[PDB]
C-alpha cells in the first residue's frame, strides 16, 4: 500500500547526498537531469494531470523530503 510513497522518499534521499502543488512547481525545470524520476513518481499521487521567494530546487527537495517523511510517520 505505502510502496509508492516509500519509493519517492528514497528517490529524494538519493538525489540529495499537497502532492499536486509540488509537481506543479517542479514540472518547470527541464535543464536538470536528476529530477526526471521525481516528476514521474509525483503524478501518481495527483488525481488530475499536470502540464507545463525565488530559492533553488535543492532547497525545495529538502522541504518536500521532510514533508513526505512526516506524511509517512503519520501514515497519510
Amino acid at each position, epitope marked *: 500500500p505505502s*510502496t509508492a510513497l*516509500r519509493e519517492l522518499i528514497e528517490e529524494l534521499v538519493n538525489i540529495t547526498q499537497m502532492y499536486c502543488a509540488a509537481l506543479e512547481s517542479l514540472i518547470n525545470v527541464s535543464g536538470c537531469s536528476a529530477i526526471e524520476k521525481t516528476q514521474r513518481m509525483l503524478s501518481g499521487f495527483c488525481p488530475h494531470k499536470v502540464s507545463a521567494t525565488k530559492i533553488e530546487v535543492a532547497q525545495f527537495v529538502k522541504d518536500l523530503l521532510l514533508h513526505l*517523511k*512526516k506524511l*509517512f*510517520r*503519520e*501514515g497519510r
Partner: antibody
Amino acid sequence: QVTLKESGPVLVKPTETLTLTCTVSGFSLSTYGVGVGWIRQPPGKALEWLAHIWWDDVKRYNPALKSRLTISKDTSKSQVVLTMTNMDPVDTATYYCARLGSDYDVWFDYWGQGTLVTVSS
Amino acid sequence: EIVLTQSPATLSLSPGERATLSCRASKSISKYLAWYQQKPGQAPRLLIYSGSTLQSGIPARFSGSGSGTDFTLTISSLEPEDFAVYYCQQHDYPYTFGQGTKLEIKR
C-alpha cells in the same frame, strides 16, 4: 550512550489503569529523527507493538488496542509515558521501551531492560 | 491483515553449521523486514533491517534476503553465542512480529 529505562515493576488489578514511564538518556526527545516505542511480550510468547511517539508529537497506536492506549512525551523530563486503561490478565507481560532506528521508518535498535507488569485479582 | 509465520518453530544445529530461518508474510511487504535475536531474560537485539542491511555490532556471518512474501535470515557458520530465539518484524504498520524460531545447539 543511548539508554532507556522503564519505571519499576507494577501490579495492576483488572479493569484498572497502567502507567509506565520510560526514562531516556543519551538523546534529546526534541531532536529531529527521535522516536520511542512500547513493545510488550507475554511470558513465553511473541512480541507485540503497542505505540510510538516522535519528537514532533506524531503518534501511532496498535489498531486493536487504539482505544485503550495513550502515549505522550516530555522533552525536559526526558520521559515517555504510556497509559493503558481497562487492564486484563491477558496483558500480563514484560513491557519494553525502545528507540526507533530510523527518522521515518519503524524498527527498534536500542532497547530498555524491560519491566514486568502482572494483571491479576 | 498481514500475518508473519516463522518456520520452523525450533531448529537443531551444531556450531560451524549454516543456519536458515524463515519468515513468511500473507501478503507482499517488499524488502522491508527486520530481524531480532533474543536471549532469556534479555531485551531483543536488532540484527538486520530492510531485508538484508546488517546492523552495526553484529558479526558478518549474519545476513538476510528476500522480498514480497518469502524472507530468510541466514547464519554462515554458527557460534555458541548465536543460539537463541529469532523474531522477524514488518517495517510497515501495524508492525507485526513473527512467532519466533528457537535456535537450539545440537550435541
